[PDB]
Amino acid sequence: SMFLPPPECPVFEPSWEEFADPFAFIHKIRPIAEQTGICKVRPPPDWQPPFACDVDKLHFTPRIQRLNELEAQTRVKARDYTLRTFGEMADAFKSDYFNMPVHMVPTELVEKEFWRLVSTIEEDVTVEYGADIASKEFGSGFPVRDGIKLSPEEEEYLDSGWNLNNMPVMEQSVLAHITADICGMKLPWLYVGMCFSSFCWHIEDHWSYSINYLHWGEPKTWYGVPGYAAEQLENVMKKLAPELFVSQPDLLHQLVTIMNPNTLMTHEVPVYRTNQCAGEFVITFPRAYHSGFNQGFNFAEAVNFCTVDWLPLGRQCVEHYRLLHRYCVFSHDEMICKMASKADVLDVVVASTVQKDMAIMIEDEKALRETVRKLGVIDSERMDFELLPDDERQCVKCKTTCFMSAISCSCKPGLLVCLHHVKELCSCPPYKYKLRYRYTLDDLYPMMNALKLRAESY
Ligand SMILES: O=c1[nH]cnc2c(-n3cc(CCN4CCC(c5cccc(Cl)c5)CC4)cn3)nccc12
Ligand SMILES: O=c1[nH]cnc2c(-n3cc(CCN4CCC(c5cccc(Cl)c5)CC4)cn3)nccc12
Ligand SMILES: [Mn+2]
Ligand SMILES: [Mn+2]
Ligand SMILES: [Mn+2]
Ligand SMILES: [Zn+2]
Ligand SMILES: [Zn+2]
């Protein structure tokens, strides 16, 4: 067995003034951190949120994990455990595996042992992970307002930007304005780990950022790849594991896997590592691949978020989903138009950035409408796309969530195609088709002008 650890990722130690605004600090570290994919943030010494819970009243059913490299795994995904009974099982496993007290096992050893065990055929080691536990039922690790009584120690951490319940609903997040209950992007998720439990190589939905906090326990080991090397990583994984790249029926059937970072390093892909300890944050940047495993019994909380910097990458992602025939979590254009309709109450920096993305959207929509008119589609009718459930407004060909416009025919009731796939609906001549649209070009230009007036306000 031979493992050459990847170089360390950047570690930041902000002052109270720097820490005060999470969004201003993330923008400042961005030129360094986006070159490594992941980064670590150590909060000021005196920032210590209170973690308190009853281990007997907290229940969950965990996922069973087979530890095999390049073996296909489902992204979404056995008995019931309390936080106490899971902890007893987790501690007994680690101490019996090494024949040592749980806290005396070196981190370098657990790391090299993890990579040996995933590559050995004759080893059939299985573990359990309390993964993707919803904060709605289980409750957040951070303080939340309840009508229970909270203590002054919990009061100071209720309104903090670093309390992961607040981060998505702040005015600097663009996901905050989305009316639809997406669930898996504005709400925090909880992770109860044990030795060797792991997360496979992946990127976030819509190429969003992520922020992870380790509340307590043994460290979490991470591997990260910068956003610029994403397609380079994917090509390496297509040659060595082609079975993972096949077309899937929906979002629930996403195929992911465990792969040694030294294999990526050999193929000239940049990889960085970190050991995240209790009380530390890890931030993942847009389109940054990441994977990892737990050193022992621990408790973590995580959430996705989108800044103004992300907006052009978000549009590029939806275009990439269309080429791959992959489902969207939400409509990017619907989010843009929702913010434009609330221009008078938006943050000035936000209004300025939304205005620039909207200008691109309008020019692309104008070109697409001219092309479908030249194909012989003459009839048209306005349609309120936001009222339809998502599974009722997807392109038959590319599976994109339609908002701005779509094509329908009376011969196929309920079916739709996006303006890129007009020839994929039916065998009828295009004069039988109808163009369904949310807004005319005349409705769109004053919406963008409202954003300009708000952005020019000083
Ligand atoms: O398309 C590209 N876009 C951007 N960069 C490209 C690139 N290079 C990137 C670098 C930076 C390497 N450097 C290594 C150390 C690291 C660091 C670690 C830990 C702490 C700190 Cl403070 C910093 C910070 C990134 C050098 N070249 N090579 C090829 C292609 C691209
Ligand atoms: O320590 C880690 N442990 C585990 N995972 C990590 C991870 N990521 C995990 C995800 C997936 C998040 N998932 C999205 C879908 C959502 C859902 C909604 C509605 C129905 C269902 Cl069934 C599921 C449930 C949460 C993305 N990253 N990134 C980093 C670290 C870790
Ligand atoms: Mn094995
Ligand atoms: Mn992730
Ligand atoms: Mn468009
Ligand atoms: Zn389409
Ligand atoms: Zn038809």
Side-chain angles (χ1 to χ4, degrees), residues 409-412 425-426 428 433:
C409 186
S410 267
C411 88
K412 298 275 183 76
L425 185 70
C426 65
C428 286
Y433 298 177

Short mmCIF file of all heavy atoms in Angstrom, two decimals, residues 409-412 425-428 432-433, ligand 7, unseen atoms left out:
data_model
loop_
_atom_site.label_atom_id
_atom_site.label_comp_id
_atom_site.label_asym_id
_atom_site.label_seq_id
_atom_site.Cartn_x
_atom_site.Cartn_y
_atom_site.Cartn_z
N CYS A 409 -49.06 21.09 -29.52
CA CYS A 409 -49.91 20.65 -30.63
C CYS A 409 -51.14 19.94 -30.06
O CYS A 409 -51.01 19.17 -29.10
CB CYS A 409 -49.17 19.78 -31.63
SG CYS A 409 -50.14 19.35 -33.10
N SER A 410 -52.32 20.18 -30.65
CA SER A 410 -53.59 19.58 -30.24
C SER A 410 -53.60 18.04 -30.29
O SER A 410 -54.34 17.42 -29.53
CB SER A 410 -54.76 20.15 -31.05
OG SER A 410 -55.35 21.24 -30.38
N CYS A 411 -52.77 17.45 -31.18
CA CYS A 411 -52.65 15.99 -31.33
C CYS A 411 -51.96 15.28 -30.14
O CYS A 411 -52.12 14.07 -30.00
CB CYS A 411 -51.98 15.64 -32.65
SG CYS A 411 -50.17 15.57 -32.56
N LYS A 412 -51.17 16.03 -29.33
CA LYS A 412 -50.46 15.51 -28.16
C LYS A 412 -50.85 16.35 -26.92
O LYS A 412 -50.07 17.20 -26.49
CB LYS A 412 -48.93 15.54 -28.38
CG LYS A 412 -48.42 14.69 -29.54
CD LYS A 412 -48.19 13.24 -29.15
CE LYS A 412 -47.61 12.44 -30.28
NZ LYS A 412 -46.16 12.71 -30.48
N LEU A 425 -41.65 17.23 -31.40
CA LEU A 425 -42.97 17.06 -30.77
C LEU A 425 -43.86 15.99 -31.43
O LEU A 425 -44.29 15.06 -30.73
CB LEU A 425 -43.69 18.42 -30.67
CG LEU A 425 -45.03 18.48 -29.92
CD1 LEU A 425 -44.86 18.29 -28.41
CD2 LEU A 425 -45.73 19.80 -30.19
N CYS A 426 -44.16 16.12 -32.74
CA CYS A 426 -45.03 15.20 -33.49
C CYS A 426 -44.82 15.32 -35.00
O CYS A 426 -43.99 16.12 -35.44
CB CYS A 426 -46.49 15.44 -33.11
SG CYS A 426 -47.12 17.08 -33.58
N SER A 427 -45.57 14.53 -35.80
CA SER A 427 -45.48 14.50 -37.26
C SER A 427 -46.37 15.54 -37.98
O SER A 427 -46.30 15.64 -39.21
CB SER A 427 -45.77 13.09 -37.78
N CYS A 428 -47.18 16.33 -37.23
CA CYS A 428 -48.06 17.38 -37.78
C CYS A 428 -47.25 18.50 -38.46
O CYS A 428 -46.15 18.79 -37.99
CB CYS A 428 -48.95 17.96 -36.69
SG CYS A 428 -50.30 16.88 -36.16
N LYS A 432 -50.04 23.78 -37.40
CA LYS A 432 -50.97 23.23 -36.41
C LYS A 432 -50.48 23.51 -34.96
O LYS A 432 -51.23 23.30 -34.00
CB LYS A 432 -51.13 21.70 -36.62
CG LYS A 432 -51.75 21.30 -37.96
CD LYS A 432 -53.24 21.06 -37.85
CE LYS A 432 -53.79 20.39 -39.09
N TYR A 433 -49.22 23.99 -34.83
CA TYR A 433 -48.59 24.27 -33.54
C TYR A 433 -48.99 25.62 -32.95
O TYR A 433 -49.46 26.50 -33.66
CB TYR A 433 -47.05 24.20 -33.64
CG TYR A 433 -46.44 22.86 -34.04
CD1 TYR A 433 -45.06 22.72 -34.21
CD2 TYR A 433 -47.24 21.73 -34.24
CE1 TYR A 433 -44.50 21.50 -34.56
CE2 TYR A 433 -46.69 20.51 -34.62
CZ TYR A 433 -45.31 20.39 -34.77
OH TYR A 433 -44.76 19.19 -35.11
ZN ZN B 7 -49.35 17.16 -33.79
#
